[PDB]
Design a protein around this ligand. Structure first.
Ligand SMILES: [Cl-]
Ligand SMILES: [Cl-]
Ligand SMILES: [Cl-]
Ligand SMILES: [Cl-]
Ligand SMILES: [Cl-]
Ligand SMILES: [Ir+4]
Ligand SMILES: [Ir+4]
Ligand SMILES: [Ir+4]
Ligand SMILES: [Ir+4]
Ligand SMILES: [Ir+4]
Ligand SMILES: [Ir+4]
Ligand SMILES: [Ir+4]
Ligand SMILES: [Ir+4]
Ligand SMILES: [Ir+4]
Ligand SMILES: [Ir+4]
Ligand SMILES: [Ir+4]
Ligand SMILES: [Ir+4]
Ligand SMILES: [Ir+4]
Ligand SMILES: [Ir+4]
Ligand SMILES: [Ir+4]
Ligand SMILES: [Ir+4]
Ligand SMILES: [Ir+4]
Ligand SMILES: [Ir+4]
Ligand SMILES: [Ir+4]
Ligand SMILES: [Ir+4]
Ligand SMILES: [Ir+4]
Ligand SMILES: [Ir+4]
Ligand SMILES: [Ir+4]
Ligand SMILES: [Ir+4]
Ligand SMILES: [Ir+4]
Ligand SMILES: [Ir+4]
Ligand SMILES: [Ir+4]
Ligand SMILES: [Ir+4]
Ligand SMILES: [Ir+4]
Ligand SMILES: [Ir+4]
Lengths: 173, 173, 173, 173, 173
């Protein structure tokens, strides 16, 4: 409310609600990725676990944004959550490529909101993103890039072997 | 690589490689300062320890920059490391004056890189420097200034006495 | 200084300063090797760790030489540190071959300094090298030779598979 | 005896007996130095302790030589122990200068015996000296040189002040 | 001696001395196998360890036979120990095939000595072999046969890969 709100633009408020929607959509995408790798005809437990953990992390990011919206006196507004872009996610390589495309879209949304906060002279917003989001996203994208390189090295002429070995020896089960 | 790189300018990448070189050069200067105060004809153990700890801290700073270069998808490029500016470092006062000149050159390089990141709208870079470098450097320069004042108070007409007492009663052995 | 110096030739003093430069150059080479294997497009953590540990070990060797220089009353003299011979290090096999070439150059420098100490009738120098350097170097070169053989066995017709498996099952992560 | 003796020259045997005499004489000199600094008109406890510890260390060195003489099948032969060179030892500076002259005479005797062992192709003798004596002597002479430099820095125009402060703040009480 | 000897034939006594020689020869063969797999150009630590443990076990078997020879009042007689049949042992498969040939020769010698004890009505001898040797040998030969099958499965078209993986994932390091 207006009782606490100070230096918190309507533009930032609306962009925070849109970023909550993006993070919840990303969480839903990772929920779908994780259950796909739990199928009996896919059966890669370390890949399931990897994506299920990211579903939780993206939900938590949305909840931290909503907490901050209320700390600044803005009002949460929820929109429909679109379903994920695919029903089946292919190989671990296909899934990791889709994940890094998703993360770079979140990172660009964070950078766009930081730029809006900078333009609005909203240093609390800018610090909030720097402290809780920007480095978490750079670290995650580096880890996904590391995983992509290792998955790609393992395809060789024996793709099933490579997919098994990556799941067994890199990912957590 | 281009697989992870996002919002990371070639200007920042090059300036990070130059700052790694500056931090490694500073580490090498402090290595030389510390071994000079271990000479049998100098023999000030607390001064040796002070500079040897700074050699480690500046190496660690370079390694954190290199880690960040790879997290952003830039490429580390190493150059020759120039030898320190002196082979013998004079009195503890001379050495502490040389140290604060070195630290203010590092601090200005940090501030210049922060300004470049600001101009490039690179908030991850700016936060990285604010979080791991800028306050560490202000604290160190304050401590060196405190030490300079105490060393200067102790010169009096008995410079050897004063140098001994500072090493014994302020510095760590 | 001349206050403590005894049986410590100017030839040995100068050769110890050159060996410090060689060890620091080797440390710098291993720093570069380790950050190359941390690139997102290389991404071999066990290889990164292997080389980063050697960077530390070679720095420590240089510092033990400098300590000994001062214990004998010689004077440390630092020179420029040349950059490593490559900016990119190829495969783990290429990197391990470069590492064993580097180590055999250090070992020959140790053996040359031992021979000079022998010729100068400097038994403290000879014992110092025997006690802290010669067996450490033989052990390291044996381990690198063991690793080269295992890497070479794994190339087969599936080089990426082999590189992954060596990193996962031999090297430490 | 001839029952165990092997590769142990009569020259080395005699030189070991002479070195025992030198170490016992050095022990006796340090006994005198320590009791002089315990006089009520001298009264420098940290200096007393420093020299009394060296009296013990030099006795222990003689006893290790005698143990080795019997392990090699040589025969200990004792000679008269000459009294120390002074009855009163002056200032801490005078005493530390006398101590480093004494230690460099012991070190030259060690180096001479090592050279004789080398010439006699007696590697057990050479290793024994390298392992238990040569580095102990280099470390001690470095510490004495460090102390001389600090004592000299403290003389200034207030020699009594400096002598008190060195004893209080460097030496152990 | 005749003071304790009872029901212990000269035939059994001589055959026990021959079996000691066979076990010591087997120990020597396993010593050679283990050091071959420690070569830098072979470098299979789990294979080294496997054979070095068998060298110890075969020595211990010989020592238990010698203990029993003296408990029965026979007299140990030692013969020359022939060197192993090869200086280089080929692949892990070649080495494991040589090991099972060696073990089946030991097992046949045990069975022959049991038959002699049976014929001599020497139940202490027969029980001694049943209790300490016959099942140990059946268990070892089963384990070697298990290993041969797994090594053979791994040759495929990538023999170096298979040899590495067997050493890493079956044998102990
Ligand atoms: Cl709606
Ligand atoms: Cl260059
Ligand atoms: Cl220069
Ligand atoms: Cl007499
Ligand atoms: Cl014979
Ligand atoms: Ir799951
Ligand atoms: Ir799951
Ligand atoms: Ir799950
Ligand atoms: Ir900002
Ligand atoms: Ir693991
Ligand atoms: Ir987990
Ligand atoms: Ir597991
Ligand atoms: Ir030091
Ligand atoms: Ir130091
Ligand atoms: Ir140090
Ligand atoms: Ir900023
Ligand atoms: Ir400290
Ligand atoms: Ir690393
Ligand atoms: Ir590393
Ligand atoms: Ir590292
Ligand atoms: Ir030598
Ligand atoms: Ir393991
Ligand atoms: Ir480790
Ligand atoms: Ir005393
Ligand atoms: Ir005393
Ligand atoms: Ir005493
Ligand atoms: Ir020698
Ligand atoms: Ir103290
Ligand atoms: Ir003490
Ligand atoms: Ir005290
Ligand atoms: Ir081994
Ligand atoms: Ir072994
Ligand atoms: Ir072994
Ligand atoms: Ir039977
Ligand atoms: Ir074992």
């Amino acid at each position: 409310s207006s009782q606490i709100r100070q230096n918190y633009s309507t533009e930032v408020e609306a962009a925070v609600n849109r970023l909550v929607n993006l993070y919840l959509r990303a969480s839903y995408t990772y929920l779908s990725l994780g259950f796909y790798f739990d199928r009996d005809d896919v059966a890669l437990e370390g890949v399931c676990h990897f994506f299920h953990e990211l579903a939780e992390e993206k939900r938590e990011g949305a909840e931290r944004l909503l907490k901050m919206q209320n700390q600044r006196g803005g009002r949460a507004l929820f929109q429909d959550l679109q379903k994920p872009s695919q029903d089946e996610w292919g190989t671990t390589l296909d899934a990791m490529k889709a994940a890094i495309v998703l993360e770079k879209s979140l990172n660009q949304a964070l950078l766009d909101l930081h730029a809006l906060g900078s333009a609005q002279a909203d240093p609390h917003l800018c610090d909030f993103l720097e402290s809780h989001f920007l480095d978490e996203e750079v670290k995650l994208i580096k880890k996904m890039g590391d995983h992509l390189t290792n998955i790609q090295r393992l395809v060789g002429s024996q793709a099933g072997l490579g997919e098994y070995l990556f799941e067994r020896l890199t990912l957590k089960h």
